[PDB]
Amino acid sequence: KLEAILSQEVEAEIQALLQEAEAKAEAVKREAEEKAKALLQARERALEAQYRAALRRAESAG
Amino acid sequence: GLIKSLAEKEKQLLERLEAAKKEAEERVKRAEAEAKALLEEAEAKAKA
Report how far residue B12's alpha carbon sits from residue A10's, in angstroms, rounded to the nearest whole number.
Answer: 10
Report how far residue A11's alpha carbon sits from residue A8's, in angstroms, rounded to the nearest whole number.
Answer: 5
Evaluate whether B34 touches A32 at the Cβ level (below 8 Å). yes
Length reported for chain B: 48
Experimental method: cryo-EM
Q: Is B33 on the interface with A (CB under 8 A)?
A: no
Evaluate whether B20 touches A20 at the Cβ level (below 8 Å). no
Identify the closest residue of chain B to A7 by CA–CA distance.
B13
Report how far residue B29's alpha carbon sits from residue A24's, in angstroms, rounded to the nearest whole number.
Answer: 10
Burial of A21 (0-12, 13-18, 19+ CB in 10 A): buried
Report how far residue A28's alpha carbon sits from residue A12's, in angstroms, rounded to the nearest whole number.
Answer: 25
| Stated resolution in angstroms | 6.4
